[PDB]
């Protein structure tokens, strides 16, 4: 509350529109982090089961232009390109949703006179179901899990996919 | 590390080039310095300067960069 | 995920996204009452 108000004072431009450190930003980032945990699980499954065609094939520079060449004389793999395009699909969906939101959906950029949602605090009430509380709880948990997964990957030396598999118990692959 | 061995014959490379506008001829023309990717050859003399100071490995340069980041902070 | 991917991941960012966002925000700031 104090942090939210002081940020609203410091950066009226972002806070007035709902950007920055706001409950709306928290909700949106929780949504994206949950979707991202799901995406990591799905890519783990696909990679383990070999469902990605030509995963280890290096894209041809002659065909795909200089963009197909990586930083240090390396080539982007077909697997990396496929995953990037999979992200491109949802990124276009994202731009379209942000510029032309559904009438019923929540809007990324809030109007000038919008009423900020009440800051939940330590934990919102445990309203079990498809409810704005459960959404926030799971979004916070997913964001924390994303950070934890990255740090486990870096510390233990395992890949992020390997860490996800180990945590889930090798059910994925 | 390969310049400190034969400094009079090796060209010191400043940094790698990643330009999505380069053609294959440009990439090949800029691939020099004994590396395998297009590069810029330094004209600042930092190689000679650091070699004289006492830097021999890339870890020394990395530690110096870390310290200077800390000092900037 | 190796360091060799960092140039391809970053140069487009630093050269198109950072300038675009900076230009948009600076435009909004300079033209604002």
């Amino acid at each position: 509350t104090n942090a939210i108000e002081e940020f609203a004072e410091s950066a009226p431009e972002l806070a007035s529109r709902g950007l920055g450190v706001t409950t709306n930003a928290e909700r949106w980032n929780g949504r994206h982090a949950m979707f991202g945990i799901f995406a990591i699980v799905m890519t783990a499954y696909f990679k383990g089961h070999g469902l990605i065609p030509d995963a280890e094939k290096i894209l041809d520079v002659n065909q795909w232009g200089p963009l197909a060449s990586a930083g240090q004389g390396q080539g982007i793999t077909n697997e990396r390109a496929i995953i990037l395009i999979a992200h491109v699909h949802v990124l276009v969906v994202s731009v379209l949703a942000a510029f032309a939101p559904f009438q019923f959906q929540d809007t990324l950029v809030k109007e000038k006179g919008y009423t900020p949602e009440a800051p939940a605090g330590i934990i919102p009430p445990f309203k079990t179901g498809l409810t704005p509380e459960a959404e926030l709880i799971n979004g916070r948990l997913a964001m924390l899990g994303v950070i934890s997964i990255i740090m486990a990957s870096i510390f233990t030396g395992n890949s992020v996919i390997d860490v996800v598999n180990l945590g889930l118990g090798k059910i994925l692959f | 590390e390969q310049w400190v061995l034969n400094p009079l014959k090796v060209k010191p490379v400043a940094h790698a080039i990643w330009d999505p506008h380069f053609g294959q001829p440009a990439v090949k023309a800029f691939t020099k310095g004994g590396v395998f990717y297009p590069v810029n050859i330094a004209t600042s003399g930092v190689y000679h300067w650091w070699y004289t100071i006492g830097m021999r490995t890339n870890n020394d340069l990395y530690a110096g960069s870390l310290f200077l980041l800390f000092l900037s902070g | 995920m190796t360091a060799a991917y960092l140039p391809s991941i970053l140069v487009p960012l630093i050269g198109l996204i950072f300038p675009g966002f900076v230009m948009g925000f600076a435009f909004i700031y300079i033209e604002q009452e």
Binding site: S10, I154 | E1, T57, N58, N59, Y62, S65, L66, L69, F70, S72, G73 | M1, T2, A3, L6
Partner: peptide, 30 residues
């Protein structure tokens, strides 16, 4: 020879310096 972990430590220090730079920019703008 420079490892990804080394580059990541450098990036973390750069991010810390960026945060401090933003703080200084705000304080100077005031």
């Amino acid at each position: 020879m420079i490892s990804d972990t080394q580059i990541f430590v450098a990036l973390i220090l750069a991010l810390v310096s960026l945060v401090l730079a933003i703080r200084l920019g705000t304080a100077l703008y005031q």
